[PDB]
Design a protein around this ligand. Structure first.
Ligand SMILES: Nc1ncnc2c1ncn2[C@@H]1O[C@H](COP(=O)(O)OP(=O)(O)OP(=O)(O)O)[C@@H](O)[C@H]1O
Ligand SMILES: Nc1ncnc2c1ncn2[C@@H]1O[C@H](COP(=O)(O)OP(=O)(O)OP(=O)(O)O)[C@@H](O)[C@H]1O
Ligand SMILES: Nc1ncnc2c1ncn2[C@@H]1O[C@H](COP(=O)(O)OP(=O)(O)OP(=O)(O)O)[C@@H](O)[C@H]1O
Ligand SMILES: Nc1ncnc2c1ncn2[C@@H]1O[C@H](COP(=O)(O)OP(=O)(O)OP(=O)(O)O)[C@@H](O)[C@H]1O
Ligand SMILES: [Mg+2]
Ligand SMILES: [Mg+2]
Ligand SMILES: [Mg+2]
Lengths: 14, 257, 83, 257, 257, 257, 14
């Protein structure tokens, strides 16, 4: 399963 | 240098898919389509905020060339003793409209315009109990007048505040509750941390009975403590040169808590 | 009290739901042989109902009869120490 | 001196053909044939004056035989607390006519006469909120009496001024929004700046993950900061005899902000 | 005047490397590197503030030419009934900015800016229980949002105050307890004052059994009484001309307690 | 009378090179070549105005016959509550252009012409918080329309004034801070002052540990207090007949503070 | 082993 770096979701969000 | 990359990685943060996060997202998606206001409650380390951020990062602001962004989900966090003008200020800034000087009715009329113009479907309010009691009039207003699912997020304190007013309690009765990990669910989650988050080069076999007597006692089932305890034990082990955690070093970390 | 606390025989108790009821009055129901845990009941529609179990913070693994807590409290008040 | 040539170049200015600029010109071309008044809004570092100036450098004045110059687009920036006289003085002077000792109701009539004579199709009023509230009656009179599209350009305060008067809000109800850079659009733009603007002999390859973290933090999506920062890093670097911008010199610049 | 020089010296203060202080600094470096918030507790004369000043006076502010100071550790002490503004006022002044008149949110925004600008790693709050209950919302916020280890210092009443808010209690859970001296440790410490602090012209042999009974009954093991009893006995005995402390003169000082 | 010659020397100002001053001169020379506006901040007795004076004089006018004199650096002090007319009045006067009665847009037009004519690179405003809020619009106009670096200079109150307007905050986002004297730097600076400014007929030897304790408590690190305390103590010393500063008069001067 | 004067620590501070 995938686990998301919280700063990568912060970078990829609009 | 090998060590210093791992020490930087371990001090960072990540979102792990877990059942409690998956269970919230499939409930919030239902409330977004049905336009129903509701509340997420639970204890102060269950990871409610990471679950709500993980949801904000699913529905990203869609863009059309010359228009305000289409923003399906808004998430805000109020400051302490938040007044009506402070709530409206933040909703307006989040949608990327700069906030000029004015009176509370100017801020209200502008917030109501931008919530319509950006096509908002859900408004998630974290730490809802920082709101001053009168502001709830403006929160109920947004939710009855606009088609917006207001979600209030908070600890048991929130309900003690809410029960002071029938008018609010009744808009926000539907709730999902976050709990603590136990039994097989705590045991399975420790293995997910070992493989997916710690990534230590020798396996620490943290699911063993002697390691789980430490972790279950120290973390009390909170995901907040589990992430903090294990990252500290991994930083401390690698900076001492061991390629995996051991019974005495995890005991040294757990003794502080 | 605020934050779901109850005070009883100088011990301070907290429990799983109490914070949502702050300012209400609850009927504590307790065993004098061991007061480290108390059952909390509340009144709804003039019908008493069970609310939660409240546990004396930081001594959940001990035991105290009410007589031990009362006698020790007198010694603390006589000594002049905080409780 | 070869080095002295490059610092004189980087100190200056240039226009990059960004999607947002293309989006404005395509929108204003609909408005110019339709003759509809409108407004452009957005944050102060998003590119608005430069995007409007590029539209003025398209559609430069015609001069057929025995006619006045035909001037399809007029662009002006008022002075602060601009009165009814000062607006007419700017429109007259942009059209190259000299003006002599009028009372305000002479300046009005001479402005209407040159706006007719030059065949003006559009009037772009930059920093529109420098206008005093009473001058909008002259802006509405230009827009209604003549076949002119007026474009008000400004920040979120402009809206606050307009919303104070129904007469104006309605003539200028339609609008386009300028917004900040994000995601793959920020990355593509940094790559374009490196090859298009900086032109150092060796590649700096700033689209590299490690370098975009410095720029994203340093610039927060504003096209303004991005340009200043990349220029200042090329100037400083060149003065010290380096062939490239590198990690350390770029952090040295960004810390000042 | 040799007497008056010793009376001017002895009424002064010193910091001694003791085990309790060396222990705290090893622990606070752990919390600063790991960015984890925590609390230090223990009875009122154990010397917790001296142990924290010995930390603040190590880890000195770093100066870079014309930049604001880089300040790794901040120690503040609040006034009674400290409100949100008073906390923000003091953090701003400690980093050397003058605080200008504003609303609570102006102080909040400026404080967040100077904490992030001065690169603060740890914030130490002495006498934490002077904080008004609402201010902990702003302390939790500083610690959630910025990478800052907040350390609360207090005594056993602080725990009675922390336990009235679930949000504070479950964050500030890690802790170190300052304890009293006994046995060999009290015995060894008395020799350190005789040879490193008092500087009397002949040995007073304070560690002898006939003298340790006097000092044990006087001090109860508190380092803050040991320094007070032994300075007062030195001041007094020099004003009578002896080169020592002896049984009867020490029993005169101890009979005041 | 030899004594009178020396009393007249001490009352007059002079400039002593110091690290802080050098730091600014180099920073401002980066900004001047890059034509980037910025601001300088710091407490009111750090000697900011004086550093700018020292800077101006290095770069006084250059000229040829018939060609109006080129003036790279313009410096002005605005009076209290400075309006758009009075700012332009001062810039016109510093450039030594003769001036006559007119409307504000006549002063504006004249000011823009003389700034362009004299080839100005950099415009330095002292006490910049004194400006009325509507003048910063003319200052942004100077900066955007002309190749000029505007350097706002002031105290922490300057930033509180700037953050009230996004349009200004962004042009002037970069900054440098003037700090206080401490440690070895205060000590070396006191020694320089003795050799370079005081020059009394017998060395006072101020670096002595007991003298610096007097100067430190009396001055708290401000260069503007240091120079003032020492001049009054040297004038007092000479008029009491001493051939150097002594402890007995230096304490008396400090007792007034 | 080293001992410190409280006031020397103040004098040495930032
Ligand atoms: N699913 C998850 N994956 C990774 N880390 C998690 C997860 N859930 C929680 N955490 C971690 O747990 C810690 C606390 O979680 P979080 O901040 O979500 O708490 P919370 O329940 O919102 O707290 P509070 O009620 O005080 O606001 C953080 O370090 C966070 O990264
Ligand atoms: N498309 C672009 N190409 C090149 N440079 C650009 C572009 N857009 C903006 N810039 C640069 O960014 C800076 C600010 O841009 P600009 O002056 O257009 O801002 P603006 O949005 O008109 O300002 P404001 O909204 O405050 O009036 C300038 O240095 C300008 O040259
Ligand atoms: N490490 C030490 N070295 C030297 N003297 C010490 C030391 N610790 C304490 N003392 C002496 O004893 C006193 C103890 O007071 P201190 O302020 O250190 O206690 P505290 O624990 O901060 O008290 P409270 O909790 O009541 O504020 C000091 O003022 C000093 O005179
Ligand atoms: N470079 C210097 N050399 C010598 N003396 C100096 C220097 N700078 C400042 N001083 C002394 O300290 C005083 C403070 O300098 P100055 O008057 O420039 O203060 P300032 O920081 O500009 O004041 P404010 O912020 O209140 O406007 C001077 O009057 C002078 O006596
Ligand atoms: Mg512009
Ligand atoms: Mg203390
Ligand atoms: Mg000055």
């Amino acid at each position: 399963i995938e686990v998301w770096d919280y700063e990568q979701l912060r970078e990829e969000y609009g | 240098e090998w060590l210093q990359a791992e020490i930087a990685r371990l001090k960072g943060k990540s979102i792990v898919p877990l059942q409690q996060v998956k269970t919230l997202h499939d409930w919030l998606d239902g409330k977004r389509k049905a336009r129903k206001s509701c509340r997420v409650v639970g204890e102060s380390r269950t990871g409610k905020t990471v679950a709500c951020d993980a949801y904000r990062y699913r529905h990203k602001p869609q863009q059309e060339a010359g228009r305000p962004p289409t923003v399906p989900v808004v998430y805000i966090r109020p400051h302490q003793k938040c007044g009506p003008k402070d709530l409206f200020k933040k909703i307006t800034e989040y949608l990327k409209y700069r906030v000029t000087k004015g009176t509370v009715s100017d801020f209200r009329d502008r917030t109501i315009e931008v919530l319509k113009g950006c096509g908002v479907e859900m408004l998630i309010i974290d730490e809802a109990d920082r709101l001053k009691p009168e502001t709830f009039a403006d929160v109920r207003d947004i939710a009855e007048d606009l088609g917006i699912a207001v979600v209030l997020v908070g600890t048991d304190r929130l309900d003690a505040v809410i029960k002071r007013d029938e008018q609010v309690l009744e808009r926000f009765r539907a709730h999902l509750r976050f709990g603590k990990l136990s039994g097989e669910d705590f045991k399975n989650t420790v293995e997910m941390w070992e493989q997916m988050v710690l990534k230590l080069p020798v396996s620490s076999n943290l699911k063993s009975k002697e390691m789980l007597r430490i972790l279950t006692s120290a973390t009390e089932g909170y995901i907040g403590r589990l992430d903090e305890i294990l990252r500290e034990a991994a930083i401390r082990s690698l900076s001492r040169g061991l390629k995996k955690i051991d019974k005495a070093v995890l005991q040294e970390v757990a003794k502080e808590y | 009290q605020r934050g779901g606390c109850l005070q009883f025989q100088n011990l301070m108790y907290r429990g799983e739901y109490l914070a949502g009821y702050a300012g209400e009055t609850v009927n504590l129901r307790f065993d004098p042989r061991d007061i480290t845990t108390i059952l909390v009941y509340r009144q709804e529609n003039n019908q008493e109902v069970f609310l939660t179990r409240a546990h004396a913070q930081g001594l959940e693994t001990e035991q105290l009869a009410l007589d031990e807590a009362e006698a020790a409290s007198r010694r603390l008040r006589t000594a002049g120490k905080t409780i």
